[PDB]
Amino acid sequence: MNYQPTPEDRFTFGLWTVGWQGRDPFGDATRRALDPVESVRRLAELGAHGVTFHDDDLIPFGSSDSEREEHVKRFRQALDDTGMKVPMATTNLFTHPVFKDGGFTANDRDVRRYALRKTIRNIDLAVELGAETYVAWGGREGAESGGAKDVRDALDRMKEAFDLLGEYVTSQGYDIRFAIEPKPNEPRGDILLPTVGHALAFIERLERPELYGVNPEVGHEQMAGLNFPHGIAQALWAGKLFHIDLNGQNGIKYDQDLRFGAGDLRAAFWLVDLLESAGYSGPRHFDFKPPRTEDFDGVWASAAGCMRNYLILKERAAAFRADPEVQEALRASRLDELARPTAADGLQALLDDRSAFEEFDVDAAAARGMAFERLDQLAMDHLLGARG
Amino acid sequence: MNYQPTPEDRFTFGLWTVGWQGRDPFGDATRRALDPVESVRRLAELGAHGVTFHDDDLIPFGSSDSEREEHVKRFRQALDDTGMKVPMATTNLFTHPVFKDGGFTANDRDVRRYALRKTIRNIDLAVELGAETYVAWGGREGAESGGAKDVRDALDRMKEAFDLLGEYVTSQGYDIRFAIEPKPNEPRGDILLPTVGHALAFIERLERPELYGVNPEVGHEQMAGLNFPHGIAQALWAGKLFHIDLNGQNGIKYDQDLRFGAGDLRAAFWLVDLLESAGYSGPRHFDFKPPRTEDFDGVWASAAGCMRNYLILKERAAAFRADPEVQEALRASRLDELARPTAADGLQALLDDRSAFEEFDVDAAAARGMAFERLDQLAMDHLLGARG
Amino acid sequence: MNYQPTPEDRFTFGLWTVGWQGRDPFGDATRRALDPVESVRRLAELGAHGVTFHDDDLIPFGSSDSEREEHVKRFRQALDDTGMKVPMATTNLFTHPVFKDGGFTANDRDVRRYALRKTIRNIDLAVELGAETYVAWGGREGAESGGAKDVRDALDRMKEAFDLLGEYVTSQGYDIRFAIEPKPNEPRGDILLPTVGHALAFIERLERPELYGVNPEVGHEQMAGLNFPHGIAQALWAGKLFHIDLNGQNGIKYDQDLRFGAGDLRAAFWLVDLLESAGYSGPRHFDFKPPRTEDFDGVWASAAGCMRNYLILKERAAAFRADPEVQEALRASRLDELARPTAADGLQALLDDRSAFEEFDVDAAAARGMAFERLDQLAMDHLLGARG
Amino acid sequence: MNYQPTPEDRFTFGLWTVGWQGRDPFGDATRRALDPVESVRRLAELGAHGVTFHDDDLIPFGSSDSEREEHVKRFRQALDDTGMKVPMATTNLFTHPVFKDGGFTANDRDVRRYALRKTIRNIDLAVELGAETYVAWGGREGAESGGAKDVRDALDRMKEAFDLLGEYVTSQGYDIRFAIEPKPNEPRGDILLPTVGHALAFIERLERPELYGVNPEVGHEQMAGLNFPHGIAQALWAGKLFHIDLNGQNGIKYDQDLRFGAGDLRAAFWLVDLLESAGYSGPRHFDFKPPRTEDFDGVWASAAGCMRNYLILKERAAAFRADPEVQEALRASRLDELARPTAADGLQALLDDRSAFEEFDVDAAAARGMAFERLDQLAMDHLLGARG
Ligand SMILES: O=C[C@H](O)[C@@H](O)[C@@H](O)CO
Ligand SMILES: O=C[C@H](O)[C@@H](O)[C@@H](O)CO
Ligand SMILES: O=C[C@H](O)[C@@H](O)[C@@H](O)CO
Ligand SMILES: O=C[C@H](O)[C@@H](O)[C@@H](O)CO
Ligand code: NI
Ligand code: NI
Ligand code: NI
């Protein structure tokens, strides 16, 4: 009944989320800029565990070394005063006009080198602040037209960039891992490594694959009409879910970044069920934007809503899995059989097993119902709190 | 000017394409069944190089060993009489009611074993006929609801299945490779390994990854709103493009399987440009369905159209790449720079290079236009044959 | 707490829903055909109010007048024995190969005439059985290619068809109205009158517009990524919501026809809220397909689930609207102001009102938050039954 | 062979198109602001016929009456010096924070009144400059959440707004018509009157429907996965195509506003074919955004490309329709029959016609192929300039 979050829940927010001023492609900002220090304080009061940042969220682009030092000290004091942590950091390689054709895969070589130096500089800061994960979102890596980018060459440049970052981390002896955040499009017509699958495949071609994982975002996969929980399951199966971005999205359209729980509610339920049952111990990070219709009270209400929805869904998913009637239904649908090896007896045994082919009664097997609808209605009843 | 195909062009068609009777979710068949022998003859006359098949296209499900032998002999004679090849074969693990919850990942263990035996049986036949690639399309592997399938367990079963097939091939000393064909949905609500990326990632977790590649289909990736040429480039980059399915699709909706060239025409141009420039030497396979509005003359016109469109696009892509004005435009857009290493000088050299950060003039770099629009209009002019 | 349906709830089902055999584009039927009489009985036991039918669901295509009479008598007796009603009927102008290019807009004139006669014949039967609404779903009206159909001519033929049906109804003195059911695509590449909006616009060009309305289906509008509740609101605003098809759909892809409640759950909540608050008194019709993974027990579980979900959502929507805290939030968000005329004072008064422009403080107005996030979280809490 | 535009072609551009600075949701501007006077001159040199504007593009928001007068005089002189016309004008009711919840349908009544006064003020200016059409794009009319907007009330407010504008125009004796521009989403989660169909339906409920039409945009309808040429055909059929916005879009995602010709090339061909054959005499207006990767030379290249592509497509569509082999194919596909009335003989004659039902040979009719594939390949050959 009580859905109050505590820092033990590991809820985190990016500074750019509650700090989003409301500027969109067709309108000016509707809210004044927030001082990172005020955000840290406000979030701590709501029950958050920590915050994340892009280098440029914390230190205005173009800042001198002294100003940079000042901005960091103020922030550090706010963390000390609240007990807030900084589990992840990332680089802004998308806002400045110089990154109009990308950062790591920009056609101009000088821009690619600059991108790497800007990233490395923030990796040092991230480590200093205690971050365990460093996220990379290649928002500008891609194209609007076919001849503008040779994708094979671009992937060589992307691999070269990540390999160099791995070499840097290893040489400095840092205890930090990278997580690639996929997105299919926006702001580029098509973005490279568009989904969790493409990102996972790419990671296997890096020199030190063990240092890289993925940071999937619910809305991003939904922008390609994909099943988010399924994508997360594949990431977990590969042992690559290093971090996760939680939010809401209503189908295939622009990236809405609604508060978590909004958008596809049932997908949110299945996501929470999976994370909790798989024992994901990383942060529950919200990358969302409080709609521009809201004033400051609305941004804090929206932020609180992210955490509340996760906690309600967690309760309902747990009740679902603990319900004896559901456990019975899972057996009726043969989920237990799905977990048993198809042929632990081996290939030869399988080939010699007449019950597997020559004497297999296909019609009898075909007539068995899967009982998935009853199981799904039990899930619906639990989600809606209408069990009886 | 002449766009006549010859077997040298490597165009192939599945028996199920020109043989599609026109039955859809809301209507009965509009065409009579075609005898595979007649299809082979008709295709040979059109200039095709070969045909492909699912076990059930060639041998009616439930056929006795004698009938099976008869069906194969007739087919073999047609191949001998025409000079047609069979470069690829696949298994039908989706039509029969027994596969309603899948083949390799069905919840019922007995069905999974049956699926493997049915596949192995057709692998032997494929080798006998000279096929070099064996395709697997897990059309029924997936779900309509969240609790019906634990994806981690399903992926274990999928890996187990492919590992066993690899062991079989290796033990028999066959010279055949596997290609996984992804599809995001339809006929299941969500299909496992939904895109080329997910398939590539999965392959890296198999015991013998070198035996597996992908068989992407233009319409399938477009069903998720993805850029097909980009996906193919990633597959080539990984050295995994073993085969390809060519067709047309108009956006995000049901799988239309229109003739190649129809649907997204510009994507078709960029695809051909990529395949030809990368030196893809595999078959140019068409997996399409002549619309049910057509009679038999219409199916052959549609089939001929697939090949004609590929040949026209090939001519235009070649003219584009050979045009000195385009080569100049590519340099203006720095495609040459994209192909040069970002830091062949090494990490330390990069960190010490003041021109890469401390003295980098971001504003000057930012002011350079990419000239992508002029380049894209040159591509448009070439596609439309309006160069001057 | 009790969500048991009674015939008073007006829940109806098409014979083709629970009777769907499971045949899809890639597979054969998984269930045996149901006798309409058994369906009527089974539905009555579940608490349904009535059933609907296509002519061909009730009388096999090609039936002689005697067989036709027999099929109708049996059905009629089942209705009498159960108390079930038949509030709506429709024509199957999509299954038979003759309708491959359409019914009312087929290019062949003889087919268009046949389509009209087949429809008229079933209108007589519908009236005999007591149907008040006659639905028309032009599933085959459309095209896969641009030159195949001149849309202006096709719309002339569509208007001609509906005008003739109106003349027939009027001349016979029948008390029955028509409802056009839109769908954007599938089985045709693009279907004419693709959304509720296009259908409403078309109706205004008919000779007797008062006889025609719309029969929107949740999944159909969602196939175009549209907001279903918004579409229904426009239909109600125009006084054209004559009937409605309830089901579930997971985004933009093939038409899934999942049970109501599945798919976009929040959209389902807002739909129910709107129907109940607007006083829609027509039938709550379910046009869904129990997944082919199910046996007969599963189809009845799925059917029961449709009604259960509607009843749960009705309870939650009512609690939401009755909550004093929500009523306060609605005022905070100025929903009360939205309902007040912008300028009941008139045009001249508006032009002379300096507070509306010359002395309007745009900055003060701009600074007011809309408080939509708090309102939406109150809606979420009510839906999930987590109010406190 | 020559594709040079002349003012006779009626090509127009909005000031906000070539003047777009490149600011998107994730990045700052990449180009400096253009002075409207320079845009008029540059466009005139390219062969454009005229320009269009939003009030705020021409007169900075908040300008005093004197500055306003100055800005208008400069603009007027540029028009006089070049011969450029201003056929359409519109209001910016989306950029300023005050319109965060809409203009005509904002929940706050004072904002709705302000919106009307701002619009009326620009209508006077539009008439002064000679504009014949006044466009309204309700970009902010809509919502991100269900309870934020009661759609029935919002439509009452929308009708009230348009009715008042009609009364104003009529009372002043202006010769100007309105055109509503639909868009399904972005910047709002869902926008009211999302498609051409919804807009057409709404127009029929206004007090003076004859004063209102639609201004469809290719990319907007494609954002809902709809067939643009089909939508335009419905608009023409109703006599409501008052203006049109030409651009390119690659499927269902954010609004790209690519140059015309880019995106769905075949849809562009069918659109041009329809406009030219139907005798649309209104302006060919381009509402596009030169990608932010471009410098100023790139924006002019992109603008020129819009016109070039329209002219090439016009040539190809005309050659297609004039080709005797195509005319023969159109008859083979019975397009001539589609244009003939289904039953000019009348209802009674139809009911008594035994050839229409009792003696209709459905099987013979069903066996006729439509020959749509050959027709479509002839269209493809013409588009690609590969006829022989
Ligand atoms: O869409 C944008 C991305 O998700 C971004 O906000 C962050 O996650 C990392 O930059
Ligand atoms: O959509 C279906 C698939 O593409 C299939 O037809 C073949 O490629 C392999 O079974
Ligand atoms: O998708 C199909 C349609 O919705 C159909 O089943 C019925 O509503 C009317 O024929
Ligand atoms: O997407 C935005 C709209 O199309 C807009 O730019 C103009 O047409 C009218 O404001
Ligand atoms: Ni994001
Ligand atoms: Ni996002
Ligand atoms: Ni993110």
Ligand code: NI
């Ligand atoms: Ni396919």
Ligand code: NI
């Ligand atoms: Ni396909």
Ligand code: NI
């Ligand atoms: Ni295929």
Ligand code: NI
């Ligand atoms: Ni339907």
Ligand code: NI
């Ligand atoms: Ni449907």
Ligand code: NI
């Ligand atoms: Ni329906």
Ligand code: NI
């Ligand atoms: Ni637009």
Ligand code: NI
């Ligand atoms: Ni647009």
Ligand code: NI
């Ligand atoms: Ni526009």
